[PDB]
Amino acid sequence: KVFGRCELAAAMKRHGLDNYRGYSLGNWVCAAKFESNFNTQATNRNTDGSTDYGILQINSRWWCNDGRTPGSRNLCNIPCSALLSSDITASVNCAKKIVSDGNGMNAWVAWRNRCKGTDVQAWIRGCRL
């Protein structure tokens, strides 16, 4: 599923991401935009042989099981395919875990490089939230 911007903002806000670990909703929308282009089905291979999955490009190195990342963990206790669903519940639950485990949203390289230090609440401007 490719979300609209406000459509994703509203879903993220319902699952409790607005201000989660102090990151305003616009941060999460911005991250999704640049990580996945709002596409739940996005996948991208990494140099170490892991893959990033879903709307927030969650890594098989640590967070989910994809069956081809030998030696990896599955800290969200899910198949990586669960992160590609039209229902973002699993991605959101796993992202909460990720953002809590030390480096905050710097875990998302596109957020660091394209959202951090920008006017991120522009990403929710116009939305009826």
Side-chain angles (χ1 to χ4, degrees):
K1 171 175 176 67
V2 180
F3 278 78
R5 178 175 60 87
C6 292
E7 184 187 16
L8 184 60
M12 287 179 151
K13 182 171 189 183
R14 171 165 59 84
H15 295 84
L17 283 181
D18 191 16
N19 314 309
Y20 194 87
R21 289 299 266 230
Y23 292 89
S24 69
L25 187 57
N27 283 284
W28 296 102
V29 176
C30 186
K33 168 67 187 180
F34 295 123
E35 288 288 356
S36 69
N37 211 19
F38 301 147
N39 184 2
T40 70
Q41 297 193 79
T43 62
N44 291 108
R45 195 73 185 264
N46 305 312
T47 67
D48 71 353
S50 70
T51 302
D52 289 349
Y53 295 85
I55 205 157
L56 284 170
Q57 292 290 278
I58 288 172
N59 191 264
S60 66
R61 176 67 48 195
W62 306 110
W63 302 107
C64 62
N65 176 57
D66 65 9
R68 67 170 193 193
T69 312
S72 74
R73 305 295 304 284
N74 178 11
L75 295 173
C76 294
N77 294 303
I78 49 166
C80 296
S81 64
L83 301 171
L84 306 179
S85 177
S86 57
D87 177 346
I88 68 168
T89 301
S91 284
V92 170
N93 288 342
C94 189
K96 287 178 180 179
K97 288 193 184 43
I98 297 169
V99 72
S100 296
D101 218 352
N103 291 321
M105 286 194 76
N106 295 291
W108 286 281
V109 167
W111 177 88
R112 193 168 71 233
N113 289 332
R114 304 180 76 178
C115 302
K116 183 183 191 179
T118 73
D119 193 357
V120 286
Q121 231 62 201
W123 287 93
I124 66 158
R125 281 175 205 161
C127 306
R128 185 95 76 73
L129 285 166

